[PDB]
Amino acid sequence: SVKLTMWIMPNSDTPDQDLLKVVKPFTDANPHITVEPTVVDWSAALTKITAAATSGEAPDITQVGSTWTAAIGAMEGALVELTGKIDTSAFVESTLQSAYIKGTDKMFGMPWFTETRALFYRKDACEKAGVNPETDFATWDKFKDALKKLNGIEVDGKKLAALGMPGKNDWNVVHNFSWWIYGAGGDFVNEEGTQATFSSENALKGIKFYSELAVEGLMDEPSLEKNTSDIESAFGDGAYATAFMGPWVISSYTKNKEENGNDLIDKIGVTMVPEGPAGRYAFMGGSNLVIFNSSKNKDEALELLKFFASKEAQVEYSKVSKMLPVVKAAYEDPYFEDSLMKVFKEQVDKYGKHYASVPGWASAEVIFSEGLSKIWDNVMEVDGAYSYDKTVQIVKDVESQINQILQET
Numbered sequence: 218s219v220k221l222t223m224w225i226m227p228n229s230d231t232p233d234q235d236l237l238k239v240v241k242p243f244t245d246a247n248p249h250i251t252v253e254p255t256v257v258d259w260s261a262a263l264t265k266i267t268a269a270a271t272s273g274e275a276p277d278i279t280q281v282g283s284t285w286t287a288a289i290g291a292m293e294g295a296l297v298e299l300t301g302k303i304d305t306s307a308f309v310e311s312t313l314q315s316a317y318i319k320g321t322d323k324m325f326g327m328p329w330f331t332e333t334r335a336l337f338y339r340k341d342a343c344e345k346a347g348v349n350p351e352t353d354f355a356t357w358d359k360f361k362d363a364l365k366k367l368n369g370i371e372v373d374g375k376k377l378a379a380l381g382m383p384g385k386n387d388w389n390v391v392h393n394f395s396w397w398i399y400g401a402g403g404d405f406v407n408e409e410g411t412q413a414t415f416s417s418e419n420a421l422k423g424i425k426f427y428s429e430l431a432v433e434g435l436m437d438e439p440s441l442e443k444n445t446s447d448i449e450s451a452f453g454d455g456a457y458a459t460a461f462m463g464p465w466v467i468s469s470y471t472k473n474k475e476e477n478g479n480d481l482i483d484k485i486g487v488t489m490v491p492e493g494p495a496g497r498y499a500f501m502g503g504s505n506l507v508i509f510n511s512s513k514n515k516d517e518a519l520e521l522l523k524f525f526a527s528k529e530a531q532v533e534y535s536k537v538s539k540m541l542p543v544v545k546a547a548y549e550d551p552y553f554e555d556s557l558m559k560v561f562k563e564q565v566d567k568y569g570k571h572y573a574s575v576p577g578w579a580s581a582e583v584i585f586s587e588g589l590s591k592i593w594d595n596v597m598e599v600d601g602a603y604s605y606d607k608t609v610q611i612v613k614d615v616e617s618q619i620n621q622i623l624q625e626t
């Protein structure tokens with residue numbers, strides 16, 4: 218028989234077991250094929266995938282962050298070109314842009330799932346504070362005014378910080394600035410994807426508006442030293458009135474109720490990100506699946522990728538991971554009438570914006586994580602009083618290095 222190996226990032230509570238439950242229909246129908254998943258944590262995934270593409274010590278298949286697909290596909294001989302091998306008509310068209318290398322008609326990944334970051338809020342905090350979450354989060358200015366009412370609000374003894382967000386030590390550092398830059402009227406690169414432009418007046422206005430929510434005491438500053446995992450868990454413990462998070466947190470908050478009696482899940486709602494002066498824009502992320510060119514079982518691997526794109530496999534993986542399907546027909550399933558999931562779907566569809574799918578973007582994210590986190594060091598005044606001018610200089614320095622990276626293509 219054929220033993221297909223696959224790498225997956227931690228997309229659900231028990232990643233390997235949950236993947237195996239989703240692929241069981243495939244292996245039942247193909248008893249001569251087995252699937253063996255291996256988990257690779259997000260922090261190491263880019264290094265391990267890059268090394269596997271070069272060395273040939275690689276699985277047949279790997280999950281790849283959507284923002285990294287062009288980086289891997291652009292490596293000569295790294296991935297199987299999938300152009301014309303997958304029926305793209307079943308996919309939500311917008312999810313295909315990250316599967317192609319910008320500037321080419323070459324498809325090197327298959328969209329697997331998508332995700333966006335939405336605004337979670339505590340319903341009990343909002344009522345006690347006189348905040349109507351149906352209208353008071355709709356714009357930047359109403360949002361900031363709501364945070365002032367929410368900051369220091371007491372909810373059953375606990376004093377809550379208005380907004381809680383991470384600041385360091387993972388890939389989300391740039392993701393969490395993204396829609397603030399877009400909403401201000403900026404972008405990270407030019408239309409060609411060849412020149413960094415996030416030091417523009419508009420991009421800086423978004424960076425300034427967001428970072429100075431913390432300077433004004435509305436965003437919890439101790440949390441800016443932490444990563445996404447820490448802040449997701451803190452919100453689940455009732456530490457903040459609001460937070461921007463992906464849909465996967467619904468899984469952990471649900472488990473917290475079922476296992477520990479924590480009913481935070483029943484006290485929260487979700488709404489779209491507030492509208493900025495450019496209009497509403499949201500982060501569009503997700504993951505693709507790729508076949509390594511060193512695979513000795515490419516026919517079987519392609520069969521597995523096609524199964525992962527089937528309606529039922531898309532629905533079942535969404536139920537366990539809370540990620541959004543990339544296949545249109547999956548949204549016909551009754552599961553998608555869930556009020557929370559509908560917000561993420563509506564947001565990504567109407568307003569989701571994905572980074573340019575250029576080969577240098579993966580390298581830029583490494584620079585972003587190190588560089589933009591220094592904005593929070595400025596805000597936290599670990600080395601002198603906050604200065605907007607320091608933030609500007611940080612952004613310009615990061616932009617200069619991003620430019621050198623882009624010019625390697």
Ligand SMILES: OC[C@H]1O[C@@H](O[C@H]2[C@H](O)[C@@H](O)[C@H](O[C@H]3[C@H](O)[C@@H](O)[C@H](O[C@H]4[C@H](O)[C@@H](O)[C@H](O)O[C@@H]4CO)O[C@@H]3CO)O[C@@H]2CO)[C@H](O)[C@@H](O)[C@@H]1O
Binds near residue numbers: 228281283284465
């Ligand atoms: O930039 C690269 C890439 O990023 C993608 O976005 C990723 C984030 O980078 C990543 O931090 C995030 O990780 C989630 C994970 O999906 C959840 O499953 C996980 O849930 C935990 C839970 O907190 C624990 O309580 C429990 O024990 O286990 C599970 C899993 O271990 O929580 C983390 C966040 O802390 O996932 C994002 C989406 O994949 C972008 O989508 C992509 O576009 C980028 O290319």
